[model samples]
Target: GLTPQELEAYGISDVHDIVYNPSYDLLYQEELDPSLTGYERGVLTNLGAVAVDTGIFTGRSPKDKYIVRDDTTRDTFWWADKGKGKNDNKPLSPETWQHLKGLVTRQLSGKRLFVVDAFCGANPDTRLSVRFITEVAWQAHFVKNMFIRPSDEELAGFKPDFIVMNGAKCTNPQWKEQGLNSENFVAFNLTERMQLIGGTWYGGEMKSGMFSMMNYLLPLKGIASMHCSANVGEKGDVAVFFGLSGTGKTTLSTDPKRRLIGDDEHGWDDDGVFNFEGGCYAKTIKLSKEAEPEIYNAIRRDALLENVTVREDGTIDFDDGSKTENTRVSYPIYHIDNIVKPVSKAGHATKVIFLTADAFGVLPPVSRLTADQTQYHFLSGFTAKLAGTERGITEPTPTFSACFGAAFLSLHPTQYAEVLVKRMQAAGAQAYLVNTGWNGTGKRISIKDTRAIIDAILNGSLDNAETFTLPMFNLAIPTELPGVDTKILDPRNTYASPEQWQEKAETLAKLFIDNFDKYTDTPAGAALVAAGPKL
Candidate 1:
C-alpha cells in the first residue's frame, strides 16, 4: 500500500489503490497473462511475451507534445515554432500546466495505478532515477524491460529525479479547450519535475518522454545523449549507428561479430558511449529469420509485441503486412547471444556509421565523409518518411530531421552536433554514410553489401583503399572493393544515361539546399554548407 502522504510529498494527491514495483510473477499472474482489458499473452511462437492493442494512435504524436515554461526554464530552451526544427517544443504557461495537473489528478481519483522505479542512463554519473506512476501494468512491464532494472536494495528507498504521471488511457474531450492541439497530451514541466501524459496508450510515449528529458538534462551535464545504437567487437572496437525508426539501427547494430550494447538510445560522454536504454525495441514487420537471425530468435518469452498481426490460430505471421508496418517487439539487450552487461564503453568509437534510407535512391551506396560534410549531413539527418508511422503521412516522403531525431529534442540541434563533433575530433573517429535505401533501378541494397561495407570499415582496409572524389556530392568514393561490384558504388553509374542521372541529381540537390535553409543561421561554418550540394 502506498500512503497518501507519500503521494502528496511529490505533489500528487488522492491515490489509494496502487501497485508499486510488484513482482514480475504477481503482475503476470493477476493482470497481464490472463488477457484482461487491454492485455493478451503471446500464444504461438512468442510464448512468454504479451501483445498490446494501441487503438487509433499507434505512434508518438508530435503535435500533441508540449514543454511547460516558467521562471525556471523560460530562457534555457530554443523558442522556435517553425520547420521540422520546431514540431512539438510548443511553449506552455504555468497556469495552463496547473490546469493540466488538476485534470490528470481528477482522472486518477479512485483509480488503480501501477508504479515503476527505474533509471534511464547507463552512465552512473548522469543516470536519472525515474518514477513511473500509471494505471496500466503492461506499461510498467514495458518500462521494466526498457530502463535499468534496479535491484531490491536500490528499489528499497528510491526517490525519482523525474516523475512521469502516465494517464495514457485517459482521454479528455475538452483537451482542445485546455489549449491542446488534440485530445492527446504529453507535457513536461521542468521546474515541477513531472510529466502529464493523456489520451494515448502508445508505449512509445512513455519511452520517448523520458528520452526528451534526458536529451535536455544530459546536455546540461555536457554530454551528447543521442537517438542512436552502439555495439562492440571482441577486440573492443566500437561502432555507433545513428538513424530514425525503420532505418535499421537495431538490425545493423546486432551483428553477431559484435556484442550488443543497447538498441535505441545512448550517451557519448567524456567516458565514451553508454546506453540510455536497457532493452531493444525493434521493428518486426515482414521479419526474416535468415536475414536478421539474432533479433528474430530473441522474440521469445519475456518479449512484448505491439500492433502485430495475429491469426485465428494465434500464431504470429511476421510477413503479414495487414496490420501496421511499424509493428515492434521489445526485449532486453542481453537476449542476444553475445552481450555486455555494463553496456558502457570507456574508449571512444572506432567508426561512426550514419545510416539513411534514401527514398530518392540518388545517394551513393557507401562513401567516406570529410569532417565538414559529416557535420552537414549529421544536422540534416536525412531519411525517407514512411507511411502509417504517423498521422497524415501516407507515402515514402523525404524528410530532414536535425541530428536524426528532431521530434524528441529538448535542446537546440547545434548543441548535440557540437558535442558529437568535439568528441569525434578528439577520438579521431572515422565516419561513413551507408545508404540502406534503393538503387537507381528501385532495387534495395542487399544485406550482403551492407555487411561488406561495415566489414571494410571494421577490418581497417577502407581507410587505406584508393578513392576518387565524387564532385556532385563531394564524397570520397572508393575505386574498388573486394566481394562487391565497383559500378553500383556510385549511384550515377547505375543510372541508364547521363541525361537521366543528371536530372535526378539536380532534383535531389534542390532538396538538400531547400531543407537546409532553416539551419543557415546556425553556427555551422561555410564549409559545412558548401559540402551539401553544388546547387
Candidate 2:
C-alpha cells in the first residue's frame, strides 16, 4: 500500500479515509456572535443544514478504485485502485483520463460536496455508468450528500438528503409509484433545476441536464449560480437575457464592452450573488456575424454539438433547419472576449429584460414596466410558439411559462413570483418587456429593423421616445425610432402602407386583453383584470 506522501508524489493525494457521518457533531460550539441571529442566518442555516443532514458518510470502508469513462460510450476506459490487484481495465490515452481523475479527486477532498444528476434515467448508459463510479468515489472519500439511483423500495428505506425529480417526468406514473410529490421531493424541469442548483441551461445546440441542474437548482439552495455568459459593465450595469431557443440571450448578454458575469443561472444571496455554470450554451441556429457577432466569432473545434443542422461539408447549416428544429449550440462563456468566471456571489441587477417572440404582433416592441407590473408580467410568462415549421407545434398554441420558467419551479408559482418581486423592488432594478418579434405594422418587417430596435434599447437612445399613450394600459408606445425618425407606432414603417396601422393595433390590443384574463385570480392579475378594457 502507498503512503500519503508516496501517493502525493504520484499525483493521487486526493484519496482520503475520513468518513462524514451526518449524525456526528460537525459544528463546534463557540461564543455566539450576537449580531448574527436573524432571517439571513435562518436561510443560510436551512441550506447548510440540508447539506449536512443529507450527506451520507461511511465510518469505515476500504478505499475504492477511481475510473474514467469514454465521453461518447461512457464505458470505463481507465481505472486506478490503491488495493493490490492487477490493472486489468483497458486504459485510454493517459491525457484523457488524467483530467477526469483530477476533477473527481478534487471534488472528493473539497470541504463541501454534493452531486445531483437531474435527468438520471433519461440516458441509461451515461446515468447508470456514471452513478456506479461516483458512488465508489463517494464511499472512498466519505463524501457527503449525493443523489443515487435506487429501487422504489430502496428509495423509501433510505431517506434522501435532498431529492430532485424532473418536473415533466416526475409527473409520470412511475415517479408517482414511488410516492414522490412536491411535498416530499423538490421537482424542476430541465431548465429550472439547472438554474436553481447553480447550473446552466444552454438552449440552442448544447442543451444538457447538467446545465439545468447548475443554473436553477443550486441557486435556490443559495449556492450563487452563474453560467459562462454573464457580463457586468464598468459602470456596474447588469442585465440578464431570458428567452427561448434562439432569441439571442447568450449572444447579447456576452457583449465585449461589458465584463461578463455569467451566461446562465445565478443566485442573489444576502451577501451578494454568484454564478453556477462553468460554460455557455449558445444558439448556432441560423447564426450570422451580423446577427450574433460575438457568439459567431466564439465557436471553435472543441465546442459540444447537440442537434444543430450541418451542411454536406460538415460545417453548421445555420439557416436551413430541415434536419431538426431544435438546433442547439454550446460554447464556454470563458471562450468569449468578455465573461465573468466563478461568480460565487450575486449582484443587484440594474436592468431586467424579458425577451419574447410574439407572433401576434400586438405587444409593444419594448415597454418599461413598474416593479409591480414587472412581477405581474413575469407571472404571465407569455411567449409565442413557432408554428408552420416541419417540427409540428406542441400543445397550447400560444404558450406561456409562468415566472419566465414554469417547467422547473418546485414551489407554488407565487413563491418564486414573490421572491423576484421583493428582490427587484429592493434593488430598484428596472424591467422592460422587449418584443423581438414582428411589429404590429400589418406588414413583414426585416430582421435589421428588429436589430436596430435592440440596439436603441441597449444604447439608451429610445428610453424617452413618445408616441401613443394608453393611460389605462399604463404603457407608453413609441411613435418613432429614438434616433431614427421611422414611425414606430405607425404600421406603415413596416407595412406596405400607412392605411393598415389602426387595424393592426386594435387587433393586438384585443389579444393582450384576452390573454390578460387568464391570471385574474392572482393578486397582480386581479389588479390588471379589474382595470378592464382600457384601450
Candidate 3:
C-alpha cells in the first residue's frame, strides 16, 4: 500500500496504480528508436534524457518504461507495489528509480547522446514542450538514442546537433549573458528576437498550442522549412508568393500551367525544395468562385472551416458578419488537381515575387528593381495596413510590417533579408514587385486592370518594356514589360476623376507626410525622404 507522503516523495502525487502492457511497451520501444535519428529525434531524445537524469520527477514512478538492446531486442520494465508511494515528499521511490536507471542505462549504453533543452524558460510554455516531445523527441529517441544536454555549464559537454528555441525566449542565461556565437548552434524561434545565437525568422503565430509545439519540433527534424506559398510552371519556372493574411498570394499563384509545388511551407534541400505541409490555408473573406475558383471549389465537407459564417442548411453565408469575416480555411493540397506532388527537389528558387496590397494606390502594377533596390526593399518589407470592412473605412489605412513579417521574424529583418538576397543572387532568381491592389488614373483600377496586370506578369508580356515612370513618386518603375502604356499606370485612373484627383492629391500628400513623419527616425523613412518631392 502506498502512503501519501511516500507517493509525494516519488513525484507521483497525481498518479496511482501503474499498469503495464507488453504490446504497448514494445510499440513505444520501436517508435522511440526511429525517432532518435530522424529530423526532430535529436532534440526529443535530449529532452527526455534531461528530464529523467535531472531528478525533476524523482518521486513519480513511470507507469511504463522500455529498454532497447543492441541485439534488436526490447525489455519491458514495470513495478508492482501497486498503490505505494516511493518516499517522503519525493515523487519516485528508490525502487522505481533503481529499476528505471538500470533499464535506461542498459538501453542507452554505447549510444551517442544529444542534449535537447525542451523547457528552458522560468515559466515554460507547455505546448512548445509537448511539440518537442511528439514531433522531435520521439523521433530523436528512435534514431540517435540521444540524451538531453546537461544544464551545468562547467561540465565537459557534447555540442548539440541543434538547439531549438521557440517564441522569443532564451533557455540558457550563459548564452544570453555572454552573447554567444551562433555558428555552431542552430536555434529556432517564433517571431523576431534580435538577440540570439542562431539564424532567426518568423514561424507565424499559432492558433493552437498543438500547432505551436509542432512548429518547434517539425523544423528541427528537417521535416520542412516553412515558406509562404510556392508554385512551378511546366517549364520549371518557379514562383514564390509571399504576403500577409489578406493579400491574394494564394489566389494568384495557383495558375493551372504551374505545378503547384506547395501552397504553404517547403524545405529547400540539396535535392531541391520539398513542401513540408500537405495542405492549403486559404482566406475566405468575400470568397467568390470568380475571384478564387480553385480555393472556393476546394472547400468541402472535410475542410477545416475557420471564422467562416455558415447558415442553417449548411450553406456558407459569405456576407454574414455575425462571425469574424477574416475566414481561414484549410484543405489537403492533394485535393487540388493542379498541385505539385512528391515535392520539388530543386534546391534553389528561380524567381521570387513579393506581393503587396498597396492601399495607398501609390505603387505601379509591376516593377522590376535592381539587386540593390530589391535587397533594400526586402529589408524594408513594407506594406500599409488597411482598416477591414468591419472597421468601415472607405479607403485603405496605412500600416507597415518590416520583412513583410515583423511579428514572425526571430532575427533582425536585415539579417534574413540579406540571406534572401544572397540566395536570390546565387540562384540568378529575378525579383518582381507586384501590386495586386489598384491601378489606372482616377478611382481604384477595375478588375479588368488587375487581370491585365496579372496576365502581363504570367505571359511575360511586360518583360521587354523599358523603365516606366512611377505615378506618385515620379521615379522610374523598372519594366520587364514592353509596349505597355506608362500613362495608364495610375491604379486609380487619375484619382476618382480629375476634380477628385486634385482634392485627393492634396489629401494623399498630407497622409503621406503624416505617415512619413511617424517613421522619420527610421532608415526607411530617411531613404524615402531623401528620394525627394511628393510626385
What's the distance in Å from true for residue 225, model 2? 9.0
Against the hidden true structure, what lDDT does model 3 obtain?
Answer: 0.42
Report lDDT per candidate.
0.78, 0.42, 0.42
User: Model 2: how far is 187 from its true place, Å?
Assistant: 8.2
lDDT, candidate 3, 151-196, per-residue tens: 2441233222222222111122233332333211222222211011
- What does candidate 3 score in Cα RMSD to the true structure? 17.3
Candidate 1 local lDDT, 186-244, one digit each (tens): 88999988888888877788799999988988887788888888888888778888887
Prediction RMSDs, each to the true structure = 2.8, 18.8, 17.3
Angstrom error of the Cα, residue 150, model 3: value is 31
Angstrom error at residue 131, model 3: 4.4
Score residue 267 of candidate 1 by CA lDDT.
Answer: 88
lDDT (C-alpha) at residue 262 in model 3: 67
TM-scores, each model vs. reference: 0.93, 0.57, 0.55
What would the per-residue lDDT of candidate 2 be over residues 1-535, giving only the tens digit for each residue? 1234422432334544422222112211110123433211111121111000111110101121112223521221112232212222222233433333344334334223222222221122222111111212112111111112233453334322222211111112222343222111111122111111101111210122233333333435533332213445676666655654344466567566777666655555444344444455555557787866776665553233444444444455567655444453344445577655433223676577777766655456666676656766676666764465356632213655655654433233455556555656677767777766555443333555655665566666667676465444455557677544375543335556544544655655565567666667556668855343356
